[PDB]
Every structure is written in C-alpha cells, then in structure tokens.
Design a protein around this ligand. Structure first.
Ligand code: MG
Ligand code: MG
Ligand code: MG
Ligand code: MG
Ligand code: MG
Ligand code: MG
Ligand code: ZN
Lengths: 86, 204, 214, 97, 150, 48, 129
RNA sequence: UAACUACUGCGAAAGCAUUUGCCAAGGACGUUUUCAUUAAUCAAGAACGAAAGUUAGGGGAUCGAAGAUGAUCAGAUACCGUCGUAGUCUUAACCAUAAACUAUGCCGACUAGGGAUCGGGUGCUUGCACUCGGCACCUUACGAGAAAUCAAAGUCUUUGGGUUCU
RNA sequence: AUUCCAGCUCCAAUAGCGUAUAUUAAAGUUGUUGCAGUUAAAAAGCUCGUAGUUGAACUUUGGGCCCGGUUGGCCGGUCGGAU
C-alpha cells in the first residue's frame, strides 16, 4: 500500500504461510517459523545461514504441518526421497 | 551431501532395535511413511524416510543459537532416561516425568521455560506440552508412530514407540547428529564412543 | 522500576527491538504489559462500561464489578481489556493491563483514490461475538465514524477517520459489541488483498538475532 | 432441552416397535426402551446345597438353573436400583458394569 | 435418486472411452445388422437383442460397430413397435397390478403401487406426444390397457 | 436454497407471498381492515 | 437435481481454498465454467487448469495459489444496465480498488472493468476476490 | 405370536415377527443391454393414514372406560383391592386425527478421521480386504450455533444451486 | 420523597416549545437486496400430482495480418498548453 507520491503507508507487511500463502496475523500464536541450518561441505552447519519456512496455526491445527514441511523441504533439497506428488 | 545418508552400520541399529516395526490395524492417514503391511497386522516403517527426517530434525536443533533453549520432553517411562542423556550431551534442558501445566504459559510458575524448540517421545502421552506449545509460537519435533496424532507437530520422525530400545535409539541417533553438526565429533563416519545401550531404560 | 522476567521484555529494556511492528511481524507472544508501555508511549485509555455481576450464595447477592477498557494511540493501534473484581478501581487498573496486552494493528486504507495518507479501512470486514455482529465498511473523506457511541470510541482510538458500520444482534450487550468490533478491526490485517501478493523472503526473529542478550 | 441423543430408547431405523409389560407393575413399555436383565440362578439356593446333596439320592447329577428374562419399566428399574441416576458425562457410557 | 422412492442407488453401465472400436472384433457392420434384424422378426425387443449380441456374439455396443442405434436399425427395416418399448413394459406392469386388485381389494399397498406405475405411464406418454412418436390424442385408459399390450 | 423462490421469472410468487405475510403485521392489518373508522371511539380522529 | 453447473464448480473451489488445498476436481465442465476460470487466471487468482476429456461433460483440475478469498455465482443471472454495475460492485466486492464482478455480455464473459472500457453490459454471472 | 430379539431388517408414512403355499409388488447390487432430457419441487386436486370413536352383521377367552364394590382419607363416586358394560377381535362402511417426533421439508453438489454392522458385488488363499447401497455409531471441529449441541443444525453481512410449506 | 405540590438553583431547545392522532426512518420486527422454522412462533402424518417456478453437457476456436483511433508518452522545454 503506497500513496500517490510512492511511500509505503502500510504500518507493516505481514508474513505468509509457506504451505498456504495465508497471512499470519499478529495474534496467531500457533504460527511457527522453523529455521533449518545450511550445512556446508563436511557437514558442520553455519552460524546464521538458515532455510526459513513459516507455517500458519491453521495448517498445524489440521495435522498438515508435517506433510507441508516434507514438501517444502524436498523442493529446497533438504530431503531427497520423502514427499511424493502422486 | 552424499556422505550424510544411511550408512549400513546405522541400518543395523534401526533393524536391531525394531524401530522399523509400526502400529497394526490402526494407521493414521497423515502417514505415507510406510513400506508395506506384513503377513501379520503390523506395518513396516520406511527407515530410509526415518533417517532423512532424523537428519532434518537434527539440522533444526543445530540451527538454535543457545542450546539450552531446546527442551526434550518425556512423560513415558521408556523415554525418561533418553531425554536426560540428550540434555547432558546436546546442552538442552529436559523435562522428565510430570510436565506441569502452565509451564510455557504462566510466567509466575517455578518451571517456566521459554524454549525455541520442543522434542517429544510420544505426542499422545505428552499431549499437554504439544497443546501448550501452540499457545506461544513454539515449533515441535515428535518421535511419532503410525497411529500417533499429528496436530501441532511440525517435523515427525516415524518410528516404533512401543519398544524400549527403539525410543532410546532414535534419541541416541538424534543426539549424535546434532553433535556431528557443530564442531564436536568431527566424524567422517566414526561410530562414536558412547553406545546406544546407554540411552535405554534401566529396569530395576 | 520494572525488572523483566520474559525474553521479549529483556530485548525491550535493552532497546534492541525499537517498535511494536517487529513484535507483530513475528507474532511474538506479549506477556508483560510494560513491553507495550515502553514501545508505544502515548497510549490513551478509556473505560466504556462498568457492570455489577452477582453470584448467588446462601448469604445472598455477592457482587463483583466487570470493567471494559479500551486503549489506543489514535494511529493504528488499539486494545480491549475485560476484567471483573471485588472493587471497581481494582477492576479498571487490571483492565488497562489486559487492554495493553491485547493491543493489535489496524490496516487503514483509502475509500477510492490513493491520494494522501490513509483515512478509512482497506476493505469490508466483520466480526461476530455472541449474537452481535459488526460490519465495518470503508467510507469517503468527511464521513466521520458512523457508529454507535461505544463502537465510535474504539474506532477513534484505533485512529480511523471515516467508516460506515452496520450491526446485527443484541447490540445492547455492550461487552459482546465491543469484542465483535475488536475482531473486525483485528481482521483488517487478516484479509489478503492483491497489493500484499508480492512474495517476501521471511525475516529472522529478534529471538534468534539478539539471542545472547535474552 | 434434549437429554439423550437416543431419546432414552433404541429405535432409529423403524416406525413402531411392539410393547412389553413391566414385570413389577405391568406398565406397557416399548421393547427397545425396556430395561432388560437376564436373571440366572440355581433352583436350589446356596447354603441349601449342603443339606440337599446329603439327602440327594444319586450324586448331585446337575443342580439346574432358572432362566427368566426380566423386562422393567423406567420407574420400577430406578426404584429397585436395577439402574441409577448418572452425571451428564457418565450418562454417555454404554458399558455393562 | 429414484423417481418414486427414497432409493439413491447408482448402479449402471459404464460405456468405455473408445468410440471407434474394437480391434479384436472381426465380424463386419453389414453382418451384425442381419443378426439384429433376424432377432427382430423372431419377436424380440431392442434391449433383448443387444443382450444376445453382448453375450453369444462379441458385439460391445451396436452403435460402435454398426454406426446406428438398434432402434434406428429396426425403424429402417420396418420392425418398429406401435408404442415404445419402455412404455409397453410399464403398461404390462399396470395391467398385472390392476388385474391383481380385482381379486384383492384389501391389498392397500397394491392400490398405492398402482398409483405410482400409472403416474409413470402418464409422464412417459406426455413425453412421447411432445416428440411425436405417439399421436397427439394418445391416452392411457385402464379399461383398454389389456387390449393394447396383449 | 433459502426456502423462497430465486428464479428470474418468479416475481409473481414473491409479490403474492409478501402480500399474504403482511397481514401478520399489526399496523398493516389495522390500516387495511379500517379498524380506526369501524371500531375505535374517536373514529380515527386525534381528539373528540 | 443439478441446476447450476457453474455454482457447483465455484462452490468446490471455495471449499478447497478454505481447507488450504492446492488443487480441486470439478465436474461437470462447461464453456461457461472455462470462460469464468480464464477471467480468474488473467487476474492471477488461480494457476493452471486442465480439462479432462471423458467423452461426456468433462472434468477440470484447477490449481490454487492461496490468493482467492471468495469466488461465487449470482443466481438468478439478473439483467444489468450499464448504469447499475456500480450498485452490484458496491454490494458484492470488499473494496473499490480490487475484486471483479463477472458478466455475460454479447461482447463476451468478462470482468466489470473490461465492461466499463468496452462500454457493454448484459447479465451478471458471479464475482471473484 | 414369548424366549431367539439387537443402537438388526423391510415399508411413503401409519406400521410390519409361528409354518408352508399362491398372487402380484419393491429396493440395492451387477451390466461394453435400451430410450435419450422423458427431470426436481409442486397451488388446485387425489391415495394411504396408530389408537380411540361411529353404523350394521359375526365373535365375545383376557383385560377393562362407565358402573358396581372393599379399604384408605376431614372428604376420596382417586390412586390400592374384587367384579364388570361398551370396548378390546373380525366383515362391510365411516372417521382423518396423535409428543402421526429425528419436535429437523424434498432434490443436487462439496467439506474429516475412525472402526463396527446389513444387503449385493469383486479379489482371493476362504476370512479378511476393497467396493456400491443402507440402518446407525465413535473422535474432533475445520466450520456452525443464544447455548444445549450439530458431519449436518457446515460450505450465511466474504450474505444468491433449485423448489414447496409455515 | 434525587420522581408528587411548591421555592431556589440548574439543563435543553428558543420566537418558539409542548401535547394528541396518523405516517416514514429506527425495522435484517415483512427480509428482492435481506429474517426465521431441532428446543424461543413456525417443516404439511405420508406419498402421488396439474398449473407455477426451475432444469446436465455439446455446434468458429485459435492463429497470421493490416489500417485508421484514445490516453500516458518521450524532450511539456515558459511548472500551462502544443506536435
Ligand atoms: Mg411413531
Ligand atoms: Mg445420484
Ligand atoms: Mg417427485
Ligand atoms: Mg393441498
Ligand atoms: Mg396436528
Ligand atoms: Mg424475527
Ligand atoms: Zn414398572
């Protein structure tokens, strides 16, 4: 939300669920932001350097947070043969 | 990488512990982690997936900046020793036995943790931790079976939680991988001095 | 003096997190009320309704007092606290605590043209509490707040200039009215408009960045 | 307010069920609703078996059992304590003991 | 589901995707028409025909192999029934139940069921009169029903 | 549906249904029966 | 019986988007369903979809992308003068800035902005936001 | 028409339970059979409709309104106890109602886990699974609701699938 | 007697202010938009059925061209208009 003269007049810009694109509200206290560590060669895992996902309360509530990670992880190469489309 | 996969020596420990065995007629639909049902009613947990989930879980734990902000819950008898060992090795603060409602909520309580990650041995029996986690933006790991409830669990390690060895073994391996990540063990495949049998329950 | 006993509150006293937007970004559970009093200083309060309630004993009529308190800056933040206590001014004080802890953001927008600093709401949004339902409908400039006196005040303290309202249900149940209006303005940031479609990269929480201090 | 999903009977699926008469008071009651109990016991009672066995020509042979299907009405079963009042939650339990 | 009942049953044929078909069937289009027409003279209905060609012969659906539907085959050859097959079988049913009620007046269920059957007759007949396969003054009369069908 | 006809050509039913249901209102029934004139001491005048 | 094939399609879409699914089977298909879906695609409320020929009415498999709040029919398909689109948009849409009332016009099925530009009107069909 | 007899079946509902015949009827399932929009819901108008009740023949065991009658009681032509008329059964006619209740119109689609069970079908390794169609039931609540609660009472101020009645 | 009859003081509208009856809004308490019908009032005992209302999918779609238009352009250059 810009005005005429550019300039973001938004108070802030919400995050969005990685599984569903639903806005994660200020009060959604069952929302969660997982950080997976980016492993280097040797497999040490670096300070900082995260593969950040975020999941809404809604998805967790339904018991779909697991299957949503497996998909989102396997698409970013963190798994290899877990999730399936069929 | 290609090195962080199932070594055959680890697959012996899974198949020895009977962590590949699963729940029988009961079988939750939120579980494609299943090879096949045997001649008997039991289902065979796909231990390839079990490993991949474990490493994934390890990397999440590994990402946590202050190790004490992880917490490792067990109310179950069979998981009580395992969480205490994991705490010692991995630097997490555990909760054996009674969880205490108002742990994560309620700042007045004496047992007032403020974690950044939770692990749980059975989500059915440790349901109060999982439930309380959802009130305060805390992620969750779980050593689920194929009949276990899946609500407010983010990453689930499929495994037997009937057996005594299975629980401790999955707890052992998890503690191992969070150590291999970070400069502790510096492996290149080194079986590790501490046995799996350390983690298992005592039985007086 | 304060002395904080919560990670978030540590960061607020230190002055690592500066504004409440960083809380709302990450959905940080706010437990201490002084977190908000520091970040958001010019936060006016008002008491909407005090109502006697009564439990029946063998004694007779044992009366507590249910206060309904609304906080806000008149600049896109508002809160609602309901508390009942033995004494009146006891209930008010503990209400302003809960009001502060409840505080949320209000997505303000424009009725038509993208002219000069938003005045109305973005969208049509409703909330329902009990029988009561409150719909809030964006209005053009110079409309004012077209609401009943109690709802009007909650919208003034949120910092809306121009909005239409329609209610339905027992609006005389004032606690339920205000709670439904509060769900409405809460839901302004719930609704995914097309201008918020752009995929951002997920920022890291202050409870990982400034982890040592907590 | 409704008290029981079942309407305190067991009909769902049919229009009418023929009635039966309460064993105590003869109140007509639809079968499905009746608080039924089987009452099985030996024709000779316990303690008399001692004295019966000695006087019994032949061995005991087979001391037979009475078989009598009781059907109660609700008021008679509640009076007799064949069945009792429960709490709102405990009402739902359908298990024998 | 059902017109005159609470029954919601889905049982039916599933015709295959293949229109132009099949590759295992050798008998020609002109050959099967003869087999149809042969059974028509012998005094069978379009439904009864198509059963025999499914079972004893290999004919999947006559519309595939022949091109036209069996009723058109009979309509061309001049073995058209005076009133459609489905209507006939409903009338047949009415006449049965009507004849039954003459002896059994206290069969209240038969009286009911007769209302339903005759309703279906009247609905069908209405259909046929519109699309002009019955003449526009055709009428199901309970009197002259047994005369028509048999 | 909602128990009332929604069809584009359903105006007759909607109009007639509403006429029949307006007799349930108090003021309408009094206004059309002509109660004020027929009964009512003043005969539908403010004063007498 | 089945009366509005479009109503059933959009209902299915709504139910799936509420449950956080990323795909829906629709059945039947129709020209009008397809025309409707293309208006939704063009404004980026859905992704790809795939008609499945079954030698009957057809099935569609839509892909959803989280952006859709609510599609919906209007029934009956009221006639709309050019004047009175402004009332339908006021009633149906969350704001003046976004969301589309969708019309059958002799020009074609289309959003109400297109109909303003082309200077056409016809029958209201549904809405999307 | 016991026991068998059930959170089992069938029927549009009311209802329907000893055996065997005869008469038609029906759902579900199976179907690479047939017709091709013939349909959904329906003012008007019709069929069927527990019990009681009515008219006239039969029948009249049992129970039993009224009534008789012994207790009880301040009274007790009430409960309790003993008898007993119509009634209770049937044929031909009527009656048209019930808490005729799931106090939930019907048709269609979609939304969620689970195990039982009834009917048909398929596979088998022959008692289990799958499947369609049924009577239901358990958990949760996504949602809904004033709440009780509800897998429909959901997909309703983000308000429009069709239609009758109130 | 914080409520009646008064005095004082104060409030509101004010050359006007009150009362009665009717009517509109308030009334999503007539509901097309837009109500309700398990239990608050209300689903017909049940099914059939004519008018009425309503009723599955399918028939030139896409592609390649070409020509004038209308706004913002891009240099609105003098903060206003020009090609
Ligand atoms: Mg009944
Ligand atoms: Mg069907
Ligand atoms: Mg019908
Ligand atoms: Mg009628
Ligand atoms: Mg009645
Ligand atoms: Mg009302
Ligand atoms: Zn009794």
């Amino acid at each position: 939300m810009e005005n005429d003269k550019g300039q973001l007049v938004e108070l802030y810009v919400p995050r969005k669920c990685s599984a569903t694109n639903r806005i994660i509200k200020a009060d959604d206290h069952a929302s969660v932001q997982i950080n997976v560590a980016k492993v280097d060669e040797e497999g040490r895992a670096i300070p900082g350097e995260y593969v950040t996902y975020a999941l809404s309360g809604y998805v967790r509530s339904r018991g779909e947070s697991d299957d949503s990670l497996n998909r989102l992880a396997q698409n970013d190469g963190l798994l290899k043969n877990v999730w399936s489309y069929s | 990488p290609a090195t962080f996969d199932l070594t055959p020596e680890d697959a012996q420990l899974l198949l020895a512990a009977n962590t590949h065995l699963g729940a029988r007629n009961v079988q939750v639909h939120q579980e494609p982690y299943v090879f096949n049902a045997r001649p008997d009613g039991v289902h065979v947990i796909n231990v390839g997936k079990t490993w991949e989930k474990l490493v994934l879980a390890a990397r999440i734990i590994a990402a946590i900046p202050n190790p004490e902000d992880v917490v490792a819950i067990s109310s179950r008898t069979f998981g009580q020793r395992a969480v205490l060992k994991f705490a010692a090795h991995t630097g997490a603060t555990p909760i054996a036995g009674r969880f205490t409602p108002g742990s994560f909520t309620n700042y007045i309580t004496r047992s007032f943790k403020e974690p950044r990650l939770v692990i749980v041995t059975d989500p059915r029996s440790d349901a109060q931790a999982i439930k309380e986690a959802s009130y305060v933006n805390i992620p969750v790991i779980a050593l689920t079976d194929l009949d276990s409830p899946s609500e407010f669990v983010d990453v689930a390690i499929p495994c037997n939680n009937r057996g005594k060895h299975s629980i401790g073994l999955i707890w052992y391996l998890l503690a191992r991988e969070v150590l291999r990540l970070r400069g502790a063990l510096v492996d290149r495949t080194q079986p590790w001095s501490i046995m799996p049998d350390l983690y298992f329950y005592r039985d007086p | 003096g304060w002395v904080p006993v919560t990670k978030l509150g540590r960061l607020v006293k230190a002055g690592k997190i500066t504004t409440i937007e960083e809380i709302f970004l990450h959905s940080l559970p706010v437990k201490e009320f002084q977190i908000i009093d520091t970040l958001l200083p010019g936060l006016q309060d008002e008491v909407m309704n005090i109502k006697p309630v009564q439990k029946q004993t063998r004694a007779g009529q044992r009366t507590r007092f249910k206060a309904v308190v609304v906080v806000g800056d008149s600049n896109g933040h508002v809160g609602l606290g309901i508390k009942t206590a033995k004494e009146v001014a006891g209930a008010i004080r503990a209400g302003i605590i809960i009001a502060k802890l409840s505080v949320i953001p209000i997505r303000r927008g424009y009725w038509g043209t993208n002219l000069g600093q938003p005045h109305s709401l973005a969208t049509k949004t409703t909330g329902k509490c009990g029988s009561v339902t409150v719909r809030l409908i964006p209005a053009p400039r110079g409309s004012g707040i077209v609401a009943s006196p109690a709802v009007k005040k909650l919208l003034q303290l949120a910092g809306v200039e121009d909005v239409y309202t329609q209610s339905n249900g027992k609006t005389r149940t004032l606690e339920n009215t205000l709670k439904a209006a509060f769900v409405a303005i809460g839901n302004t940031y719930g609704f995914l408009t097309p201008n918020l479609w752009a995929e951002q990269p997920l920022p890291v929480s202050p409870l990982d960045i400034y982890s040592d201090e907590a | 307010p409704k008290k029981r999903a079942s309407n305190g009977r067991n009909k769902k699926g049919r229009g009418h069920v023929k009635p039966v008469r309460c064993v105590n008071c003869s109140k007509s009651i639809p079968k499905d609703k009746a608080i039924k109990r089987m009452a099985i016991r030996n024709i000779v009672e316990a303690a008399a078996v001692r004295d019966l066995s000695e006087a019994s020509v032949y061995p005991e042979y087979a001391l037979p059992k009475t078989y009598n299907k009781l059907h109660y009405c609700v008021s008679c079963a509640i009076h007799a304590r064949i069945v009792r009042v429960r709490s709102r939650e405990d009402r739902k339990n359908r298990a024998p003991p | 589901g059902r017109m005159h009942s609470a029954g919601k049953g889905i049982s039916s044929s599933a015709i295959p995707y293949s229109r132009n078909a099949p590759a295992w069937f050798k008998l020609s289009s002109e050959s099967v028409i003869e087999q149809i027409v042969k059974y028509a003279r012998k005094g069978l209905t379009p439904s009864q025909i198509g059963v025999l060609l499914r079972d004893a012969h290999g004919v999947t659906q006559a519309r595939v192999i022949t091109g036209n539907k069996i009723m058109r085959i009979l309509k061309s050859n001049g073995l058209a029934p005076e009133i459609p097959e489905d209507l006939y079988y409903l009338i047949k049913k009415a006449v049965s139940v009507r004849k039954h009620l003459e002896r059994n007046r206290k069969d209240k269920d038969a009286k009911f069921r007769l209302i339903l059957i005759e309703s279906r007759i009247h609905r069908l007949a209405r259909y046929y009169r519109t699309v002009a396969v019955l003449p526009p003054n055709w009428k199901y009369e309970s009197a002259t029903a047994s005369a028509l069908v048999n | 549906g909602k128990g009332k006809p929604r069809g584009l050509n359903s105006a007759r039913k909607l109009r007639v249904h509403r006429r029949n249901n307006r007799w349930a209102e108090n003021n309408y029934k009094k206004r059309l029966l002509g109660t004020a004139f027929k009964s009512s001491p003043f005969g539908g005048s403010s004063h007498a | 019986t089945r009366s509005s094939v479009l109503a059933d399609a959009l209902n299915a879409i709504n139910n799936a988007e509420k449950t956080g699914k990323r795909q829906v089977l629709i059945r039947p298909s129709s020209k009008v369903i397809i025309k409707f879906l293309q208006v939704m695609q063009k404004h980026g409320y859905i992704g790809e979809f795939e008609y499945i020929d079954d030698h009957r009415s057809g099935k569609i498999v839509v892909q959803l992308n989280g952006r859709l709040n609510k599609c919906g029919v209007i029934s009956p398909r009221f006639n709309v003068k050019i004047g009175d689109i402004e009332k339908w948009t006021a009633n149906l849409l969350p704001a003046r800035q976004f969301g589309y009332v969708i019309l059958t016009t002799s020009a074609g099925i289309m959003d109400h902005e297109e109909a303003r530009r082309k200077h056409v009107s016809g029958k209201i069909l549904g809405f999307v936001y």
